[PDB]
């Protein structure tokens, strides 16, 4: 599923990402935007054997566990395929844990490079919250 900006923004508010641990909804839409371009089926295999899954490109070495990643910590207690769902619940549930892990949203490169210290609220702008 390829979400649309406003749609996903609403879905994320739907799931409590609106102002979660200091992060305004804008940050999450922007992070999704650059991490997967709102594509929930987005997967990025790494040379290191792991793979990033879903709308927020969660990594299979630390958060989810596919069936092909030695040492996977699987901290989000979910098969990575659940991050490829049209329903963002699993990704969000994981993202909240990840953003609480101590590095903030800096846990996502894409977010750091294209959203950090930027007018993020612009991504929820023009939407029906």
């Amino acid at each position: 599923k390829v979400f649309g900006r406003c749609e996903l923004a609403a879905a994320m508010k739907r799931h409590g990402l609106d102002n979660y641990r200091g992060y305004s909804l804008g940050n999450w839409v922007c992070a999704a935007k650059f991490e997967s371009n709102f594509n929930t089926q987005a997967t990025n295999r790494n040379t290191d054997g792991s793979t990033d899954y879903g709308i927020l490109q969660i990594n299979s070495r630390w958060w989810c566990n596919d069936g092909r990643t030695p040492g996977s910590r699987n901290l989000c207690n979910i098969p990575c395929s659940a991050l490829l769902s049209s329903d963002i619940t699993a990704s969000v549930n994981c993202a909240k844990k990840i953003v609480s892990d101590g590095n903030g949203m800096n846990a996502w490169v894409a977010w750091r490079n294209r959203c950090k210290g930027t007018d993020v609220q612009a991504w929820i702008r023009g939407c029906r919250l």
């Epitope: 409590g16 102002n19 641990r21 844990k97």
Partner: antibody
């Protein structure tokens, strides 16, 4: 399978550090975030703070530098070091993983005169 | 600091009757609300995660609902051992906070 065992002096004196230990069984402390929660008389619970699975710690601003959560990655247990407590700090201290799934039995550590 | 006001403070009931517990946030917290059961001489137990998500092992008669600022825990056909404290907790903003608690007891 998973068990959170709390131990430590259930009675400390004014001005000195309140220290508690939470032994974790069936689950390595680096594979989960862990916290300390205390219940004050009158069912007043307080989230003291926590250590992430990656070592980042978070402390409830209510404590103010008085709190230090550290962990023993070898014996697989973590601690609570609360400086200069007072009658106020008297409560039952709990340790549970971040997700809320596991908890320690709960140990009441009072601080009377 | 997000405040959680639970009501009623106490709630008496006869096993078999159904109850509805309330938890209101002094600020919209999305769905970052969690429910705990607290029996005397015992430690909090996670009943409902994120407003309504069920916890493997918790009896079906338990269920949560709500969003934003108002949340509800529903216990249908309360049983003799469902009696105890009930606390809600927001994980939305740091420092995480707990509700004042609703004491469920026999009529």
């Amino acid at each position: 399978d998973v068990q959170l065992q709390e131990s430590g002096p259930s009675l400390v004196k004014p001005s000195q550090t309140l220290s508690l230990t939470c032994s974790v069984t069936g689950d390595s402390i680096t594979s989960d975030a862990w916290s300390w929660i205390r219940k004050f008389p009158g069912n007043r619970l307080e989230y003291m703070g926590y250590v992430s699975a990656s070592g980042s710690t978070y402390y409830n601003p209510s404590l103010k530098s008085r709190i230090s959560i550290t962990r023993d990655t070898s014996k697989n247990q973590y601690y609570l070091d609360l400086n200069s407590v007072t009658t106020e700090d008297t409560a039952t201290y709990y340790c549970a993983n971040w997700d809320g799934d596991y908890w320690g039995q709960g140990t009441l550590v009072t601080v009377s005169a | 600091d997000i405040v959680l006001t639970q009501s009623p403070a106490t709630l008496s009931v006869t096993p078999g009757n159904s109850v509805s517990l309330s938890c209101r946030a002094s600020q919209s917290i999305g769905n970052n609300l969690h429910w705990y059961q607290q029996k005397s001489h015992e430690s909090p137990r996670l009943l409902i995660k994120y407003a309504s998500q069920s916890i493997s092992g918790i009896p079906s008669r338990f269920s949560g609902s709500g969003s934003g600022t108002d949340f509800t825990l529903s216990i249908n056909s309360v049983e003799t051992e469902d009696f105890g404290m009930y606390f809600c907790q927001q994980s939305n903003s740091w420092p995480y906070t707990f509700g004042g608690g609703t004491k469920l007891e026999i009529k």
